[PDB]
């Protein structure tokens, strides 16, 4: 039974705060309507989101603790850090991040996404809204796999993530490959971190392939961002090239990040 094991609290965004009755562990209780589920998978027919969350169940990705099936919905019990703030609100309140802090955050996102790919999972909705900051541990967590897919090497022709983080080949041709599309969205994310908002709002900007910097950003960081946002997918860096880039060296540990920037 679901109502017996968890104390349900208020909305967080349909996601409710909750506590596991057993050990008072804070959880997030996420409800997904069957009628709205695009892709299904199996383990027992379940939403693909559950499939992907199980395949990645490492503190860099959110942990699915349990799930239930109801007549018209599935209920997902997800880990809830406390205290937490998502990266979107964090950037809104603090503005453009110092590069040392953006380096630590971006590095942790890179490790999390590498974890997803190694487990056969393509997230397809990397953005600041889908990243939680554990404010005490300085650890970041990738959330909301509701737009994801199994990782494959062939072309994708469907997409349901965030359009302003989607790559130009999707805008123009309705096709993309998983890894190079992910690298594009990471370029958008990195620009977002060091400039305080995403660079593109309109399709014409996305396919136009021009990056104007609205804040002081080091030449090394600008180079990495522009590389990630190469118009031609084959021109984009691999994850290894990103993490070997000069800008990415000497990252802070998560705990150092918390003590210098979050406490």
């Amino acid at each position: 039974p679901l109502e017996s094991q968890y104390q349900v609290g208020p909305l967080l965004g349909s996601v409710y705060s909750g506590i596991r009755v057993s050990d008072n562990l804070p959880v997030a209780i996420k409800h997904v309507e069957k009628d709205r589920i695009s892709d299904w998978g199996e383990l027992t027919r379940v939403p693909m989101e559950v499939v992907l969350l199980k395949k990645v169940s490492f503190s860099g990705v959110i942990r699915l603790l349990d799930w239930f099936e109801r007549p018209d919905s599935f209920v997902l019990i997800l880990e809830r850090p406390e205290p937490v703030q998502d990266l979107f609100d964090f950037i809104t309140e603090r503005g453009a991040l110092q590069e040392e802090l953006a380096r630590s955050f971006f590095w942790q996102v890179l490790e999390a996404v590498r974890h997803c790919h190694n487990c056969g999972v393509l997230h397809r909705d990397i953005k600041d809204e889908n990243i939680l900051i554990d404010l005490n541990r300085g650890e970041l967590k990738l959330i909301d796999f509701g737009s994801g897919a199994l990782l494959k090497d062939t072309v994708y022709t469907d997409f349901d993530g965030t359009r302003v983080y989607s790559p130009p080949e999707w805008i123009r041709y309705h096709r993309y490959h998983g890894r190079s599309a992910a690298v594009w969205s990471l370029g958008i994310l990195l620009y977002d971190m060091v400039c305080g908002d995403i660079p593109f709002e309109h399709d014409e900007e996305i396919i136009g392939g021009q990056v104007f910097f609205r804040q002081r950003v080091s030449s090394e960081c600008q180079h990495l961002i522009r590389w990630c946002l190469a118009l031609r997918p084959s021109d984009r860096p691999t994850f290894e090239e990103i993490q070997n880039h000069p800008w990415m060296q000497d990252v802070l540990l998560p705990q150092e990040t918390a003590e210098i920037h979050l406490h």
């Binding site: 979107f88 909705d125 953005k127 809204e129 909301d144 509701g146 993530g161 359009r163 983080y165 908002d197």
Partner: peptide, 8 residues
Amino acid sequence: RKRRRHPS
């Protein structure tokens, strides 16, 4: 300028 969330 208006920074905003973007639904998926």
